[PDB]
Design a protein around this ligand. Sequence first.
Ligand SMILES: [Zn+2]
Length: 209
Amino acid sequence: ALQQLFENNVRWAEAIKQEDPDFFAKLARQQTPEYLWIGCSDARVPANEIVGMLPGDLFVHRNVANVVLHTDLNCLSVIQFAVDVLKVKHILVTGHYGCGGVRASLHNDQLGLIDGWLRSIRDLAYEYREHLEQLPTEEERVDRLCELNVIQQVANVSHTSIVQNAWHRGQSLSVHGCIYGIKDGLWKNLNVTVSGLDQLPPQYRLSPL
Ligand SMILES: [Zn+2]
């Protein structure tokens, strides 16, 4: 049954209205998150819990292996709503270790539709085949590719005209790359933060409108 979920919900909401009966009412007036989370759909990586954010704090996109594609209006519309409408100050690209999307990209079984989705990670494992082939176990190749994927997705978000036009018009906006350990609960900074146009290769830079 979905009983427990409905029951959990009633208990969660009633509890919050005790420490603050205005909590939901105030928040309903306006959404003002300062962060957009782009992360994996993996059930072990819930965004809000991992960084102790409350409702209202964190705009969230989650997809298989936290992939950001320049022709995907799904993820791009979340980015654009976050950047243009909500004016978030930070995009947290969070991948994670032991990612199944990443792992499947490293191997050769067909999983169907997702095979196409994960293509860009497959391209990544090929671009870095020399590197990954000098690591021992699969677990290490997978985990390393997880990191490589995060760094790539950071670059991808930063290269969007959405983000660049934010910069051109003087909005403060940083794109961070982090990685969560499903083994230890730890959200780690990969230190690849991009916060302005000067950090983009000339070939990806777009002129202002
Ligand atoms: Zn994953």
